[PDB]
């Protein structure tokens, strides 16, 4: 029902198309579909194609997670080790607990060091100012940077922690920090490490972080069009591009561009656990609850908050979930849908991916929206992909 649902959204003019890639571990059931059209900078239209270069936005976080776990394999990092020496900027942040009645900020020194595991699971305290009202308020007052000057990760995320390290959960720049850590301990750029350790082993050559300078990639960027002549990825993240525009260096949180075909190669290596990226035991460890008890309660509060629908990635409020290394982790089966310990996340408002080891399925669905982006319709279109792909999988299994 992707087909009739996606076409109806094209006919209303609210999307231009979609890219969907899914596969079981062995490549028996494979579904790859590009739908609709893209617009070139000239105004010329072309059919959407499976090798169009997509903005991943926060689907970058999964790839940065792998890179950081590969550094763990190398012995350059550990999951629970103290990051204060590699990332002194993180050690220096205090913990904002709230405000007075005269709106004065109450903070406290951090009770413990920040660790890689905390960065990978959004339990370090580093929170996105646009999701955290307390950090939003703090930013309004003690930050008035209206200078557009490009900033490094460490110059962009200057806010205090939202909670004591390890005790809460809030979506934030934890993977931008982790990417910076990976650069500092490897002595090269995040892209250099990923190209060597993730993209090369999978035969991936059509990848770049923002800004996409490669001419061959620019010729296939869906997001290089008259509505987005900067190729900022506006349609994916609901509008803007501010953060990409303002940035300097790779952002492990959001910055990657990649085809749908190449992204599903990454998903499928983790699904098959084929040793191409990480040793099998390190992959297994990704599909576990890595929030402690207090952090897990905070996660569930966030999931019941007004932002909860974004944080749930389409899973039902009655489904028990945690946070693994790489995304949301279901903690129970949904018959006919995600098995327990399915890992899932997404990018912006338009893209979502999942890895379901129990039922042997992974996939990415990436809507190519038209500005202004209808957020409510994007949620329906993503859900349609997430459920219809299991319908298509069952139909195929039934035909054998």
Ligand X SMILES: CC[C@H](C)C(=O)O[C@H]1C[C@@H](C)C=C2C=C[C@H](C)[C@H](CC[C@@H](O)C[C@@H](O)CC(=O)O)[C@H]21
Contact residues: ligand X, CB under 6 A? 57-58, 130-131, 171, 237-238, 240, 242-243, 253-254, 310, 313, 345-349
Smaller CB separation from ligand X, 272 or 286: 286
131 vs 297 by CB, closer to ligand X: 131
| Separation of alpha carbons 311 and 346, rounded Å | 10
- Opening angle at CA 131, ends 235 and 77, nearest 5: 95
CB of 215 vs ligand X, minimal distance in Å: 25
Residue 58's φ and ψ, nearest 5 degrees, are -70, -10
Rounded alpha-carbon distances, angstroms, from residue 285 to 118, 295, 332: 15, 18, 17
Q: Which is nearer to ligand X, 58 or 283 (CB)?
A: 58
CB of 140 to ligand X, least distance (A): 15
Q: What is each CA distance from 337 to 249, 278, 354, 380, in whole angstroms?
A: 39, 27, 11, 16
Burial grade of 331 (CB within 10 A; 0-12, 13-18, 19 or more): middle
Cβ of residue 22: shortest distance to ligand X, in angstroms?
18
C-beta of 48 vs 350, nearer to ligand X: 350
Tokens encoding 335: 């018959």
Shortest separation between residue 118's beta carbon and ligand X, angstroms: 17
Rounded to a whole number of angstroms, the minimum distance from the CB of residue 294 to ligand X is: 21
- CB closer to ligand X out of 188 and 240: 240
Nearer to ligand X, 292 or 309 (CB): 309
Specify the DSSP class assigned to residue 226. T
Min dist. Cβ of residue 311 to ligand X (A): 6
Task: Measure the CA–CA gap between 118 and 325, rounded to whole angstroms.
Answer: 10
């Amino acid at each position: 029902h992707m087909d009739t649902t996606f076409q109806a959204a094209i006919d209303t003019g609210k999307i231009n198309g979609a890219v969907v890639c899914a596969t079981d571990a062995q490549g028996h059931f494979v579904y790859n579909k590009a739908t609709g059209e893209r617009t070139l900078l000239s105004g010329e239209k072309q059919p959407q194609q499976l090798d169009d270069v997509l903005y991943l936005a926060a689907a970058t976080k999964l790839i940065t997670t792998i890179a950081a776990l590969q550094c763990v394999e190398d012995g350059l990092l550990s999951l629970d080790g103290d990051l204060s020496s590699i990332a002194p900027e993180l050690a220096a942040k205090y913990v904002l607990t709230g405000f007075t009645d005269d709106e004065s900020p109450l903070d406290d020194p951090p009770a413990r060091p920040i660790t890689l595991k905390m960065l990978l699971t959004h339990s370090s305290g580093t929170s996105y100012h646009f999701l955290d009202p307390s950090i939003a308020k703090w930013r309004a007052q003690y930050a008035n940077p209206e200078n557009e000057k490009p900033r490094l990760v460490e110059e962009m995320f200057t806010y205090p922690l939202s909670f004591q390290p390890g005790t809460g959960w809030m979506y934030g720049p934890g993977l931008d920090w982790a990417g910076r850590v990976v650069e500092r301990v490897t002595g090269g750029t995040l892209m250099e490490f990923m190209q060597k350790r993730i993209f090369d082993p999978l035969g991936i050559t059509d990848s770049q972080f923002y800004p996409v300078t490669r001419e061959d990639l620019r010729a296939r960027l869906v997001d290089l069009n008259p509505s987005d002549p900067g190729a900022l990825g506006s349609a994916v993240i609901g509008g803007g591009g501010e953060m990409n525009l303002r940035g300097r260096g790779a952002f492990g949180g959001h910055g990657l561009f990649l085809t749908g075909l190449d992204f599903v190669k990454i998903l499928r290596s983790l699904l098959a656990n084929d040793g191409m990226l990480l040793k099998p035991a390190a992959v297994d460890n990704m599909f576990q609850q890595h929030l402690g008890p207090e952090a897990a309660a905070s996660h569930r509060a966030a999931l019941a908050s007004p932002l909860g629908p974004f944080f749930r990635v389409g899973t039902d409020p009655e489904t028990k979930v945690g946070y693994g290394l790489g995304g949301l982790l279901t903690l129970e089966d949904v018959d006919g849908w995600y098995g327990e310990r399915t890992l899932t996340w997404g990018g912006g408002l338009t893209l979502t991916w999942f890895i379901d080891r129990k039922n042997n399925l992974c996939g990415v669905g990436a809507i190519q929206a038209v500005l202004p982006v209808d957020g409510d319709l994007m949620a329906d279109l993503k859900q349609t992909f997430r459920h219809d792909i299991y319908r298509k999988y069952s139909a195929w299994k039934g035909q054998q």
